[PDB]
Structure formats: structure tokens, C-alpha cells
Design a protein around this ligand. Structure first.
Ligand SMILES: [Cl-]
Ligand SMILES: [Cl-]
Ligand SMILES: [Cl-]
Ligand SMILES: [Mg+2]
Ligand SMILES: [Mg+2]
Ligand SMILES: [Mg+2]
Ligand SMILES: [Mg+2]
Ligand SMILES: [Mg+2]
Ligand SMILES: [Mg+2]
Ligand SMILES: [Mg+2]
Ligand SMILES: [Mg+2]
Ligand SMILES: [Mg+2]
Ligand SMILES: [Mg+2]
Ligand SMILES: [Mg+2]
Ligand SMILES: [Mg+2]
Ligand SMILES: [Mg+2]
Ligand code: NA
Ligand code: NA
Ligand code: NA
Ligand code: NA
Ligand code: NA
Ligand code: NA
Ligand code: NA
Ligand code: NA
Ligand code: NA
Ligand code: NA
Ligand code: NA
Ligand code: NA
Ligand code: NA
Ligand code: NA
Ligand code: NA
Ligand code: NA
Ligand code: NA
Ligand code: NA
Ligand code: NA
Ligand code: NA
Ligand SMILES: [Sr+2]
Ligand SMILES: [Sr+2]
Ligand SMILES: [Sr+2]
Ligand SMILES: [Sr+2]
Ligand SMILES: [Sr+2]
Ligand SMILES: [Sr+2]
Ligand SMILES: [Sr+2]
Ligand SMILES: [Sr+2]
Ligand SMILES: [Sr+2]
Ligand SMILES: [Sr+2]
Ligand SMILES: [Sr+2]
Ligand SMILES: [Sr+2]
Ligand SMILES: [Sr+2]
Ligand SMILES: [Sr+2]
Lengths: 145, 115, 246, 119
RNA sequence: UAUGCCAGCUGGUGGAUUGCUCGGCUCAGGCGCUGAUGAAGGACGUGCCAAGCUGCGAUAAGCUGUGGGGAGCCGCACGGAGGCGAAGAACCACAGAUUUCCGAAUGAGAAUCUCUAACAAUUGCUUCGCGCAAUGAGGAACCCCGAGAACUGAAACAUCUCAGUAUCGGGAGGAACAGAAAACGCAACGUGAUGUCGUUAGUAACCGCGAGUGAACGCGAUACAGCCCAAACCGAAGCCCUCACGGGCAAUGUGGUGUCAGGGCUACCUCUCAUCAGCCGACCGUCUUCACGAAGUCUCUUGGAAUAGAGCGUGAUACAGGGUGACAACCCCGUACUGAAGACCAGUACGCUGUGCGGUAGUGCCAGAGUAGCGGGGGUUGGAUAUCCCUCGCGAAUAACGCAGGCAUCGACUGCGAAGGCUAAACACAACCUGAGACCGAUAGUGAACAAGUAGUGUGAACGAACGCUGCAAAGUACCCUCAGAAGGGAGGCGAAAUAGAGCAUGAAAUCAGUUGGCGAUCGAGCGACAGGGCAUACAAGGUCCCUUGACGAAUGA
RNA sequence: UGUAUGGCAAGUCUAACCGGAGUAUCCGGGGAGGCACAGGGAAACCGACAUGGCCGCAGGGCUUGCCCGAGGGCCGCCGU
């Protein structure tokens, strides 16, 4: 039995005095009315902030942490097995509609990896080089100058 | 109120074991299972690897999921395991149902609760 | 497990391995959900005329004549919900979504579980079916699909001690209530489901309470009518095999 | 259709030629064997036996066939009025069986004896 | 005990309730234009007796033909009289005949009539003659082009919002509109006509930057289809009317060529299966209608009536639904199976006839102007500098040129050729047909199950109800008595039932007549709850209750 | 935007629509796209603890106060 089902006989259906559930006055105006007067509370403040760059001049990178690559190396037997070698462009999903692929450095690298991607972070390099291995930048990744 | 008949049976079996045999774990797991689904455990493998030890059964009062690596030879007991979780555990250890754990260990000894 | 195959005379003609899906744990709540969805999804949209009771220029006289402020036309009250011939306040609306959604996995698990409930002799007898067997489902040879006559299927089911179920369903109930005026006067118990492989059994379809189906499309409803698991079913050797990868 | 309202509608509002099917009665064992039919459109002149009413068991000749009301008048199947007059009690052909036919018409005989069509 | 209070009983009144459904409501599929060859609509007629409805039109509930159908019939509507039908009627399908007057209403006028040969009016062609043609008006909504509010929201209000909504003017179709890039701009070594659906996304954008408002490219689908002029170069090689003769058109250009895979011209290579015109012309499917179509009407009991119970038996590619004196697969119509026809798809697809695709080199021959574009003023849009449009003024180039790529200029790059035109299919609606339903079930559901847009109200625009049910069968009450009496009443007859007797299934409450129980003409008013007494009570569905005594015996307690 | 229940889970769900069929149900296909899987910054742009310390509930362990202590709590540290 729901709350709605127990209302017959209550007269007011939980609204208090029968003088309550009338029009928009009970809401203090229609919709977001008085967002700066009587109902200013918990509203985002009035005003403009910043600018937006045109959508076609906006680049969207496909990100992946070293932790995701490293945890799934034995499962990724469909890729190259070196002295492991993996092209990141084939691992990340939605890499078609993305502008470039970037490897970020969150987590640990327990294996020796040779990663090929368009961009790498300072911490993505340190973790792959420090755990014995190389980082190969693509021909598309030759933008850093 | 639960709607699954199998979960209702598991809870009743966990209770029967905690009252009959010398255990407090199965009654503790039963109390968490009687609680809402949102409170139940959603444990990944990287957590069982960090806090579990060998020859000590891991009891999850919820469901085990497949994120992360498990190297330890542990017997994991849960209400359910994901397809990948059960596959990844059986490679290095053993994924056991909580219904089996009650028959194999009714006293609930040498057991670690992980959430 | 093992399932005994029967020829058109009702004699044992070998046996094949009963597939893995028949060992799926019976889950009546999930089966009931899949049937509740199927029954709701075939329901038609309805609703009263959006303008019923609003086709009048009726006005209230207001204060002054010792009468309630009710809209009147030619000294007769109109429009308002409390008035005879007035609009229906909160009527059935056509815009209402009367369909229920179900996840493919949750629905597929229900089909598997309903199929599994068919393999338990006690559940089948608990559902209501009348039979004299231990082994269930009844597994018959592929030469069943070639039968043309209905009376020939009667003889086979009598030889299989499974005809007593059609005698249960050979009693129509004249329902209580106004469903009668809408074409829903009768109803009868659900008996045997016949699952074939190529075409549904034209020979078995007219049997009292019987339902015919094919293994590529046999659903939760024909497998568990009204959400009640454990229907007395007969499979074709090839149907048993095709219903394995569902 | 399957809807009861539409079923009764089509029967009560059926055109005159379609009302012929509403005055059909079953044939006896001998007549079913002779013509290859189960039933026939009852005609004025046929001999019939009452199988269901208060007149169950009685035989008589068909005096009138009213297509409009879809009923028949059979001989001696009467009701006595208050003045003393014996008026016919209309019978539904469904409660009646044909024992002998009136084959004066060449077309009715031809229709009854052909295997392609029914009368 | 008068007037009278409470409850009940018998009978009314009333029409709730229950059961029933010839009507609604909603969803789905199919289909879809009519009209000067006078529509739609309306008026008045039309029947043996005919007021309403339906049909029909002076040939008037109908005439003819073909096919179907069949022994009956003469609508709704069961009367009386009479008639028609084996010379094959009724009835149904198709086609045809007739088809008054008003009505776009068209000779002129007029409240449905009248006055003295009529396309009135406006047009095109033209034999310049109304000779040949066109337009007009209707249609449920859908569609396209114009005109365009306010309440309201913003808690006031002006921009904004309601909303390009309501409403108005004009117009087409069965669908409309759109449409083969002066496109896009995931900027690309990329896409490739157009609608529509899903998404992109409440994103970009707008906005007293308040409230609010709000795309697109792309993508996944549906369906797919591309073409014709103007000009260059030719220059009467042409077109329309007519049987012909003959006439009209046309150098202010008919016709050929050609249309960004630019084309033309000149010189060559090869070739066509492209395109355009034209002939033929479906399968399948879908929608509807139709033919055929299995098996009990056996026994006993109950009943007014078996379609009930018990017993025996049967069919099923048919156990959908309905009918029939009560619960019916087998009594009747149907239902499955098979087959037929019409309509739509569609004058489409396929096939065919004809034409002829294309490539090289040269050639500044051709390629749509108040346009592109700028400025003033407005509207509109998400369009922001960067939407679309209107108005006023100004205003270019000529492919060696021009436009676009979300501010302007110049260069580069990429895309694309405006100011001419056509175009199937996929999508909207629901008049019309058919189907369906966890919709409503006669104060509901349409306003309308009934005479329903009826009766009735208003000068008019307009407004607008209520009314469903005898019975299995009319067997719808003969005869007699009474009475002023075809009234009514009494007696009587029918039926299972008249307390089923005509607004006639059931028959609630309020309430009325009569009557039973209780109270009652010296007595006080929320009408009762709980206790306890009087009086009253057929059975049934409740069976307990009283007194001596005795046992037990809390708190309390002589 | 919560909550209860249920499926699946580092993922999850299909939309329009297509095929089948018992033809509005239903079986199969469809991941376009949405949300989640990293954040911070107006923007350019840059890009994180699969655990380093201490308390300690439940639970487990032991030779019965002592250990291990998920979750939780207090810190460190890391991205911008
Ligand atoms: Cl930005
Ligand atoms: Cl986790
Ligand atoms: Cl593109
Ligand atoms: Mg109403
Ligand atoms: Mg009821
Ligand atoms: Mg015959
Ligand atoms: Mg005139
Ligand atoms: Mg105002
Ligand atoms: Mg306001
Ligand atoms: Mg304000
Ligand atoms: Mg707007
Ligand atoms: Mg665009
Ligand atoms: Mg040409
Ligand atoms: Mg505006
Ligand atoms: Mg009404
Ligand atoms: Mg009555
Ligand atoms: Na109120
Ligand atoms: Na893309
Ligand atoms: Na009205
Ligand atoms: Na009053
Ligand atoms: Na809906
Ligand atoms: Na008085
Ligand atoms: Na149509
Ligand atoms: Na009349
Ligand atoms: Na006519
Ligand atoms: Na004319
Ligand atoms: Na003229
Ligand atoms: Na206000
Ligand atoms: Na005001
Ligand atoms: Na504004
Ligand atoms: Na009958
Ligand atoms: Na301007
Ligand atoms: Na462009
Ligand atoms: Na009524
Ligand atoms: Na008393
Ligand atoms: Na996807
Ligand atoms: Sr409340
Ligand atoms: Sr209001
Ligand atoms: Sr303020
Ligand atoms: Sr993608
Ligand atoms: Sr008639
Ligand atoms: Sr009649
Ligand atoms: Sr195309
Ligand atoms: Sr041009
Ligand atoms: Sr009434
Ligand atoms: Sr007036
Ligand atoms: Sr009497
Ligand atoms: Sr007083
Ligand atoms: Sr005592
Ligand atoms: Sr899925």
C-alpha cells in the first residue's frame, strides 16, 4: 500500500491547511521565479563568466592511464610480444572520432612496456622508463616544438 | 523486502549456520544481506589482492567484480561473481559460492570479511 | 542429464543428453517479470475524447441568484467535473506509455529459467498439469513434425500417459463480469506446449489448452503461462538441441 | 469478426439473400447420405420433425418461411388464443430436422445433387 | 385514547441496483479527391391507406442489362386490403436510364419563384461566331502561400514570454512542400539532390545575460533518381487546328544543337547501351468480398424450455466469435485448410524501339543584373559582427571571372557556379472501408444506443436536451356482470411467471396509504453511547441463562 | 533528484530501423548515440594514491588479555 493509496479520507492529501495547494503563489511564482529575490538561496549567482572557443577549433583527446594498459597486458595477447610492445591507438575505445591519443601516468607499471602513442605526460614517461622501457612518439606526435 | 527466492534461501541458510554452529560471521553476513542492495558490497580484485592472505577464506557480503590483478592463492566466497571475476580468480585461486562456504565451513573459522 | 526419446507409438527409441540450460536455477520472480512485460506490451492505448464535456459555452452566473457558481447553459449545469454531462477530471489518456521495458539479459535469463522449470516433474505437477510420468519434458522424435491429423496426436499422448492434461483443459469457464460484452466471455486452463523446430505443429494446435511453438522463438509466456513456471511440454529431438543455445 | 456486438449486428442487419443461411435445418440420416450435405435451407413444402421445443417429437409440413424474422411455421405446431383461434408457434430451424424434401423446383434439386455447391 | 413519535409488515410511489448492449471512445491496417457532362448542400415532391426516418425524382421506397442468389417478396414497421414471383421476383455486385426547383448557379430578376434565347463574369485560342476550351464551388483533417492577437509567464511590468500560437485572407493534392550544391567545412588524400525518423542536445546560439528561448554539420536509419532550358554554333529544317481542303502561329526565332563528367566551333581517336522520348506491361504482397468446409441434436433425471447433472459417442490444418426457450467444437451461421474476384501497388518494375556515351589538342565563341554586393529603416530567427525576409537609396565582374568556408580587408588554400526550369519513392491527415481493445456500459460512454443536432430557446450569429429491457412463443386477455362508457372495476382466460399486462427484467432510498409491535393528551429539546429494567418475537442462520451449595480466591478487607 | 527491488558490471543500455514469426505481443539483429571509465583551468594547456603512516567498529585468529583488522576515522602524498 502506497502513500497515494492511503489519502482518501484525509481531505487535504498531506498539504496542511486547505488554503495551501492553490496556484503558483504556493510555489512563490512559476518556475525559477524570484531566483534573485525571495528564493535567492542555493541558486548559482547572476552573471557572465568566461568565453567559449568555436567548436571546430576544439580538440578532444582520447586518454588512457598506464594502469589500464599494464593491468591488461597478459589479456592483450593479440598484440606484439617483444623482449611487451603495444600500439595505444588500438587499445583505447572511441579512437576514431578523437583528435589524438594521450597516455597519462596514473598507477604503477609492473611490466616492461614499449608504448606507441601521439602524446605522453611527464609522469607517463618517468614510470615506463623507470621500470625499464621505451616510449615511442608517432609521426603525428611530432608537434612538440 | 527481497524478491529473489535464492537470496532469501541463502540468508536463511546463513542464519541456520550461525545459530547451530560456532559462528558469528554467517549471521553478520546475513544482516548485511537483509539490508538494502545499495549497502551491499561491490568489490573489485585489486582490493582482495591488497588485504587477503593465503589459507584464510575471503568473504564478500556482496558481489565480486573483475577490475585489477589478483596474484594470491585465495579462496574467495561471495553471493555472486562477475563472469570475468570468476575467471580471473580460478586462474590463481578459487571462486566459491557463499552457499558452498556454509557447508565446507559451518563454524565460520579462518575467514576475512572484505568490502 | 539424460532425456529419453520416444517414437510415434510411444516406445523408447534411444536417448540424448538433456542440455545445460535445463539446469538453470528456477527463478519465478524473473519469469513473472518477463510475462508481466509481454502482457503489458500488447495492450492498446485508450482514452476518452479530449473535448468530451467541453463542447458548451456555459457560463457561471456568479453571486446573486442564490446558486452555486457552477457553469450553466439553458438553466442546465455543464462542463465541470461535478456536473452531470461534465468533463472527466483525470480521465484515461492516450499519451500514456502503457509499455514496460526489460533488459535483454534479464529477459533471456527468464527464458532459460522457464525452460529449466520444464525439466522438474514436481514443479510441473505443482503448476496444475495432470500426467502419469516421472521423466519430464516429454522428448519425441523429429517425425512428429510430419503428423497431419489431430486425432493421431491424441493417440501418441495417450501412449505417453500425458493426455490427462487435455482433459483438464477440456472445460471452458464463462468468466464473471463485463468482459463478456467485449469478446472475453471464455477462458480455459493452459495444457501442453509443443515445441518443434521447422514449423509449429498444425496437428497439435487445436487440442484443448495446447500451445504450439518453435525452438528459435519459444518465449517466457508459452513456457510459463501467467508467470507460473513448470509447463508440461513436449520437445522435438532437434528442438531440444536448438533450444540449448538460447 | 471476433467481437460479439459485430457478430449479432451482421446477423440482424443481413440483406435478404444472406438471410437464407439463417433458416437452415439439419437433414436426417437418409437425406445426408443421399445429397452429401449436413443441412439444407428449409422450404415451404418440406416435412420436418421438432427436436427441441415443447413440441419436441412432433412431425409436420412447413407452411411458411419468414426470412425477415428468420423463423418457420410448421403444421399443427400451434398456440390457442383466447378467442379460440389456433395460431402458429414460430420455430427456429436450429431446433428442427428435415425428414422429406419438396423438389418441385429444378434449381433446388440441381443444387442439392451437385458436389461443387450446397443448398 | 385523539393529534402523534420509532421500527416493521402489505400495497404504492420512485427508478437506484444487478444482469444485458443495436451506441460510444481509442488504437491499427487499407484507401482517398468532387464540380458548368451543374457538385456538395438545401427545397418540394414521391407509397393503396403514409405523419417521422430511409430511399427515390414527374419513369419518384423505384426502370433496364450482365453476373450472383433463390422461393419467396412488397424498407424502417409484426396493419388491413390487394399485389408481385418458376416468363426465376426479393436480395447483392457492376454498368446503364431517369434524375423537379434552389444551390459555384452562369440570360435577367427573386426568401427555393418568375420574366423575355443566354458559358453571367474574367480569360486563352480563334474559322474573331461563345466556334473550341479554362476558371468559379465542395471536402474530416492533413498541406502550401499571406495577415496576425490577448489573457498568461516573468510571482508588478515595457524587451522577452504565451506564439508565428488563436483567429482571419488566398490556394493545391491524394497527399502536399522540398530537391540534384555559387552545398558541407567531424579542414579532409573527406561527404555528395530532398524530405522524414532516431541521435547529435537542452549542446552551440539568444536573453531586463532575468524568466525563459533554442538550432545545425555529422552519425544510424527509411527510401533512393536523376534531369530540362537560356546562350554559343545552325536559321524555317518547326508547331497547333482540320477527315481533307484550308486556316492560325513563328526571323521580336518555331525547330536542331547544348546544359560543369561545361558546352560550342576547328582537327582528329574510338565508340554508343548513358541520357531523353515513346511502345509494352506484370509477378508477389497488401486490403476487401466470395465459394467450399469435419463431427450427437442419443439414454436417464430436473425444467416451461437442456445449451444442466449423470451415462455413452464424435470431429479437429476447425476448442476464434455469434445464434439457438439455461454453461453448445460436434443444433444453425461461422472457424482451419484450399480456392475465386475486385481494388491498391502501377501505366510502376522488367522487357523493347529509337537517339547516341566518351576522349585528345586548339579556340578570352557562350554561360540568367537592379542581380552579387554596400548603406538607411523595419520584421523575423538560436543566428550571436556570423539567420531569413521586406522596404528606401546606391550598385559589379564576365570563367583570364564570381560566390562560399559563422566579424571586415588583402593574399594563400579548399569547395562550389547564384541571379531559368522539372522531378518518382520513403513522411502528414482520417473523410471512406475493415480490424482490434486490462476503455465506457444508458446521470457512463459522443451533445446524440431512442424523433439527435430531434423537441425546444434566440431577430440573428448561435444555443440545445430527456427518453434503452413484456414473453420461450403474442399465446398482447374470448365470454359474462357493472358502468354514461373501446374507460375503469369485478369474475374469467393465457403463461413457469401477469407482483412478466404494454415506459410491461430486477424494482433500493427519500416518501405515501393501510396495518403490527412499543410509547402516548402533567410534561423538556444533538435525537445517542455505555449499564440496567418493562413489554414484543414461527422456523432458519446464535445457544445460552438463572438459583442453593461447593472449589478456587488478586488488590482490598471487617 | 532520492528510495526499494532486479539484471549486468569497468562497464551498461540500445534508438530509429532490419529479418523472422505464432504478425501491435514475441525471437534474432541494430551500440548511432547516451551515461560511467580523470580531473583542473575562462582559455591556452597540463594531467592523479592498483596504498606510505596512525587510530579502530564488525569479523577472524591465539596459548583469552594479545595479534590480523575490510568498511569507517585522522594524516600524509599526488593532478590542476
Ligand atoms: Cl572553449
Ligand atoms: Cl573495489
Ligand atoms: Cl562529411
Ligand atoms: Mg461526460
Ligand atoms: Mg459485477
Ligand atoms: Mg450438394
Ligand atoms: Mg438567375
Ligand atoms: Mg497584461
Ligand atoms: Mg505577470
Ligand atoms: Mg524579475
Ligand atoms: Mg522562440
Ligand atoms: Mg551546417
Ligand atoms: Mg534539345
Ligand atoms: Mg519575436
Ligand atoms: Mg448520455
Ligand atoms: Mg417492471
Ligand atoms: Na488544498
Ligand atoms: Na567519426
Ligand atoms: Na454542443
Ligand atoms: Na440552492
Ligand atoms: Na502511448
Ligand atoms: Na392536527
Ligand atoms: Na478512401
Ligand atoms: Na410516411
Ligand atoms: Na440518381
Ligand atoms: Na464554362
Ligand atoms: Na467567342
Ligand atoms: Na505574477
Ligand atoms: Na497588473
Ligand atoms: Na530579452
Ligand atoms: Na437449437
Ligand atoms: Na536592407
Ligand atoms: Na562552402
Ligand atoms: Na437512460
Ligand atoms: Na430492553
Ligand atoms: Na557505442
Ligand atoms: Sr506533504
Ligand atoms: Sr485555475
Ligand atoms: Sr537580490
Ligand atoms: Sr564510436
Ligand atoms: Sr426486412
Ligand atoms: Sr422487420
Ligand atoms: Sr542518393
Ligand atoms: Sr551561370
Ligand atoms: Sr435517467
Ligand atoms: Sr437576446
Ligand atoms: Sr383476474
Ligand atoms: Sr433546562
Ligand atoms: Sr486469601
Ligand atoms: Sr545490450
Amino acid at each position: 500500500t502506497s502513500k497515494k493509496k492511503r489519502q482518501r479520507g484525509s481531505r487535504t492529501h498531506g498539504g496542511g491547511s486547505h488554503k495551501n495547494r492553490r496556484g503558483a503563489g504556493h510555489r512563490g511564482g512559476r518556475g525559477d521565479a524570484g531566483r534573485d529575490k525571495h528564493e535567492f538561496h542555493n541558486h548559482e549567482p547572476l552573471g557572465k563568466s568566461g568565453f567559449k572557443r568555436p567548436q571546430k577549433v576544439q580538440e578532444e583527446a582520447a586518454t588512457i592511464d598506464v594502469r589500464e594498459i599494464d593491468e591488461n597486458v597478459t589479456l592483450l595477447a593479440a598484440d606484439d610480444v617483444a623482449e611487451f610492445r603495444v600500439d595505444v591507438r588500438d587499445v583505447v575505445e572511441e579512437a576514431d572520432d578523437a583528435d589524438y591519443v594521450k597516455v597519462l601516468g596514473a598507477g604503477q607499471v609492473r611490466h616492461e612496456l614499449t608504448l606507441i602513442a601521439d602524446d605522453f605526460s611527464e609522469g607517463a614517461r618517468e614510470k615506463v622508463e623507470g621500470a625499464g622501457g621505451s616510449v615511442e612518439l608517432t609521426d603525428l606526435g611530432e608537434e612538440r616544438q | 523486502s527481497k524478491t529473489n527466492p535464492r537470496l532469501s534461501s541463502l540468508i536463511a541458510d546463513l542464519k541456520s549456520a550461525a545459530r547451530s554452529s560456532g559462528g558469528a560471521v554467517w549471521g553478520d553476513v546475513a544482516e548485511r544481506l537483509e539490508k538494502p542492495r545499495r549497502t551491499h558490497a561491490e568489490v573489485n580484485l585489486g582490493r582482495i589482492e591488497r588485504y587477503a592472505q593465503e589459507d584464510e577464506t575471503v568473504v564478500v557480503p556482496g558481489k565480486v567484480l573483475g577490475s585489477g590483478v589478483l596474484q594470491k592463492d585465495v579462496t574467495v566466497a561471495a553471493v555472486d561473481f562477475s563472469g570475468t571475476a570468476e575467471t580471473k580468480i580460478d586462474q590463481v585461486g578459487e571462486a566459491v559460492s557463499l552457499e558452498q562456504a556454509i557447508e565446507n565451513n559451518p563454524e565460520g573459522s579462518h575467514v576475512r570479511v572484505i568490502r | 542429464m539424460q532425456a529419453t526419446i520416444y517414437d510415434l507409438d510411444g516406445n523408447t527409441d534411444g536417448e540424448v543428453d538433456l542440455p545445460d540450460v535445463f539446469e538453470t536455477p528456477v527463478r519465478s520472480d524473473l519469469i513473472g517479470k518477463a510475462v508481466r512485460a509481454a502482457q503489458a506490451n500488447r495492450k492498446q492505448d485508450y482514452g476518452s475524447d479530449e473535448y468530451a464535456g467541453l463542447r458548451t459555452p456555459a457560463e457561471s452566473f456568479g453571486s446573486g441568484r442564490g446558486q452555486a457558481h457552477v457553469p450553466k447553459q439553458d438553466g442546465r449545469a455543464r462542463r465541470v467535473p461535478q456536473a452531470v454531462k461534465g468533463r472527466s477530471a483525470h480521465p484515461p489518456k492516450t499519451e500514456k506509455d502503457r509499455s514496460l521495458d526489460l533488459n535483454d539479459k534479464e529477459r533471456q535469463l527468464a527464458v532459460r529459467s522457464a525452460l529449466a522449470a520444464t525439466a522438474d516433474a514436481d514443479l510441473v505437477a505443482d503448476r496444475g498439469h495432470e500426467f502419469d510420468r516421472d521423466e519430464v519434458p516429454v522428448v519425441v522424435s523429429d517425425d512428429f513434425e510430419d503428423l497431419v491429423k489431430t486425432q493421431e496426436v491424441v493417440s501418441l499422448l495417450e501412449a505417453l500417459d500425458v493426455h490427462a492434461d487435455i482433459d483438464r483443459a477440456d472445460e471452458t469457464k464463462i468468466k464473471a463480469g463485463q468482459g463478456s460484452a467485449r469478446g472475453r466471455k471464455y477462458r480455459r486452463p493452459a495444457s501442453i506446449l509443443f515445441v518443434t523446430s521447422d514449423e509449429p505443429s498444425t496437428a497439435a494446435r487445436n487440442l484443448a489448452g495446447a500451445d504450439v511453438a518453435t525452438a528459435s522463438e519459444v518465449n517466457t509466456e508459452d513456457l510459463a503461462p501467467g508467470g507460473a513456471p513448470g509447463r508440461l511440454t513436449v520437445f522435438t529431438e532437434s528442438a531440444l538441441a536448438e533450444v540449448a543455445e538460447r | 469478426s471476433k467481437q460479439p456486438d459485430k457478430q449479432r449486428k451482421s446477423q440482424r442487419r443481413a440483406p435478404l439473400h444472406e438471410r437464407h443461411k439463417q433458416v437452415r435445418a439439419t437433414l436426417s440420416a437418409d437425406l445426408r447420405e443421399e445429397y452429401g450435405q449436413r443441412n439444407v435451407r428449409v422450404n415451404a413444402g418440406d416435412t420436418v420433425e421438432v427436436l427441441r421445443g415443447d413440441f419436441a417429437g412432433e412431425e409436420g409440413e412447413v407452411i411458411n418461411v419468414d426470412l425477415d424474422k428468420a423463423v418457420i411455421h410448421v403444421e399443427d405446431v400451434t398456440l390457442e388464443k383466447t378467442d379460440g383461434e389456433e395460431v402458429p408457434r414460430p420455430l427456429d430451424t436450429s431446433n428442427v430436422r428435415v425428414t422429406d424434401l419438396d423438389l418441385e423446383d429444378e434449381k433446388r434439386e440441381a443444387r442439392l445433387e451437385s458436389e461443387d455447391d450446397s443448398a
